[PDB]
Amino acid sequence: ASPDDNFSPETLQFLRNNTGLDGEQWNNIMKLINKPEQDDLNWIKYYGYCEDIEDERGYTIGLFGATTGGSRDTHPDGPDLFKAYDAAKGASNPSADGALKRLGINGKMKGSILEIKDSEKVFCGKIKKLQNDAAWRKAMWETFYNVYIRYSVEQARQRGFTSAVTIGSFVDTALNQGATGGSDTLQGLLARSGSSSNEKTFMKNFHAKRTLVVDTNPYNKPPNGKNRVKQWDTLVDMGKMNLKNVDSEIAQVTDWEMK
């Protein structure tokens, strides 16, 4: 059953073919990411995470902070998530609207935003029930991949780095600070991390550069940012780059208090 049951059969094939990492490696990566994001190592519960954070971004859904959209988020990734779910369920012309109809949700796409008419209780109640839906989990990971993982993996490959710690650390940075754009994104940090061909040296420099900006608003509340980066850097120091057979190390590096 193992960490494999935390994904789905097809999802594991997808992650393996596109990232080169297995179920155990991705499970460990998600534990490390979910600690600073939700202060909960039991990340599978978040497949059905749904909440209006009064963000003016609509509802936040799932594992990586996708929103349905609102005034402060006019290019939400939520529509893309629902479309991927409709495609996973077998639709020939997958769409966000099609997904909401399957789910019996009263809502629809208006521009690039999802307009939901159902109350939070009703809407999020339906999302919560998708926690063990294999097609939803696949859609969740396919979207996570298109939004953050593919870019992270490409940046690692471009430098000849393919370890689980490097990919996971890049992903945590992209998810938390953004993939591309400003000097504080994954793209920006990499531009100033040097050019070492030694993976350990590079990641040490990258982590040091990230520590300078990670506790800046709105990324994290200090010293949560310092602590999240320290998790990855500690694994590098211990030489646990492969993230396999590290259950004990993972319990130790995440053993810190949020806020």
Token code pair at residue 112: 């690039």
With vertex at residue 139, the alpha carbon angle to CA 125 and CA 143, rounded to the nearest 5 degrees, is 110
Domain 148-258's class?
mainly alpha
Structure tokens at 11: 């999802």
> Is 55 in the active site?
yes
Q: What's the token pair of residue 178?
A: 């953004």
Amino acid symbol at 62: G
Whether the CA torsion 11, 148, 171, 227 is positive or negative: it is negative
Q: In this structure, are residues 31 and 250 in contact, taking their beta carbons and an 8 Å threshold? A: yes
Single-letter amino acid code for the residue at 216 = T
The string over 73-92, giving b where at least 16 C-beta atoms fall within 10 Å of a residue's C-beta and e elsewhere, is beebbbbbbbbbbbbbbeee
Closest CA to 233 of 193, 191, 182, 181: 193
SS3 content of the chain, % helix, strand, coil (to 5): 55, 5, 35
Which of the following is catalytic: 24, 37, 73, 233? Answer: 37
Contact 119, 129 (CB under 8 A): no
Inter-residue contact 162 to 136 (CB < 8 Å): no
CB 247 within 8 A of CB 30: no
Same topology, domains 1-147 and 148-258? Answer is no
Domain boundaries, the chain: 1-147, 148-258
Is the Cβ–Cβ distance between 145 and 18 less than 8 Å? yes
Count other Cβ atoms within 10 Å, centred on residue 249: 15
DSSP string, 67-113: E--BTTBSS-SHHHHHHHHHHHTT-SS--HHHHHHHHT--EEEETTE
Both structure tokens of 43: 């990340």
Q: Which residues of 97-107 are buried (b: 16+ CB within 10 A; e: fewer)?
A: bbbbeebebeb
Experimental resolution (Å): 2.0
Superfamily of the domain at 1-147: Chitosanase, subunit A, domain 2 (3.30.386.10)
State the structure-solving technique. X-ray
Residue pair 252/230 in contact (Cβ under 8 Å)? The answer is: no
Catalytic residue among 4, 22, 52, 55, which?
55
> How many other CB atoms are found less than 10 A from the CB of residue 160?
9
> How many Cα atoms occupy the beta-carbon half-sphere of 39 within 13 Å?
8
| Amino acid symbol at 177 | Q
